[PDB]
């Protein structure tokens, strides 16, 4: 695609009897994490997680930290408010999640911005795509919506998503150009797993690719075996790259009617793979 | 308040080879709430130094974590990942299938 | 870079 995104992921969770609610924030460019903050660190601060961010100066790290400390206290206040909205006891633990950010095209221009929130894993409130209105999922979120309309929050989101977000995303893409703007193609192969005397498993592997977006499909006689293909969730290798496999059960002997097809940004052209015994 | 049991995969960073250094991975995902106990096992015993990535979540609000330690496989040593979560009646054990 | 801290929920 050559288009890119920046996302921040905020989590705040209550733990009554075990101190004040914990606050964690992580920042991503595409599938690369680049910052973290944990209010449970001995010295809480926004800390680098990718080498291209370490070069930012202190005023950068000072601002990122002071904002996250404020948010630690604000999200504790939100968790008290949300407990109220749902008439919930002070003994249970609850979770607030937020993710926000921007998508830019291969020219650095904003495609669209995002800000969504979840309470206890349930969609709660989302900034609409117009960046000026909200969608509340229930009468509790409606309360949050009235506060935000009065606080004039959507206008602040628009100014952040159109301005700072894409400018700093653009800057990161340049500072981390050798990695963020490098698609590494998958290394692939097909393995063969005898099951019985009359059927076997063909497993198609994709290793070492980046970013994680990828297509793996089996075809039998040129027709997709989507209902019969077992997919694992794309998984991280630990080294920035990802892994994935697709598997199909085939009658023994018919193995050549089956093809595995691989799409990824790193490959010059899509791949067709067969078992070669 | 709906809770989501974690999905678990156990695998290596590179294709395994008796005698060379690698990384053992336990990727847990799909779960909610975020509290989770994840141990990597070597012949049944908890491995001491195990790092993990910073807590994050997917589009669907479910959480995920990568746990990992350096190791060198053998033909002998069996490896497993043991996961506990609120949804789980007792710890789940997932062995490292090295035959892929 | 993060957004300015805003209004509580
Ligand atoms: Na055919
Ligand atoms: Na738990």
Automatic annotation (TrEMBL), chain A:
The keyword Cytoplasm does not apply. GO terms for cellular component: early endosome membrane; ER to Golgi transport vesicle membrane; Golgi membrane; lumenal side of endoplasmic reticulum membrane; MHC class I protein complex; phagocytic vesicle membrane; recycling endosome membrane. It is a single-pass membrane protein. GO terms for biological process: antigen processing and presentation of peptide antigen via MHC class I. The keyword DNA-binding does not apply. Keywords: Disulfide bond, Glycoprotein, Immunity, Membrane, MHC I, Signal, Transmembrane, Transmembrane helix. Residues 186-272 form the Ig-like domain. Disulfide bonds join 102-165, 204-260. It is found in: Cell membrane. Belongs to the MHC class I family. This is MHC class I antigen. The chain holds residues 25 to 300 of 337 of the full protein.
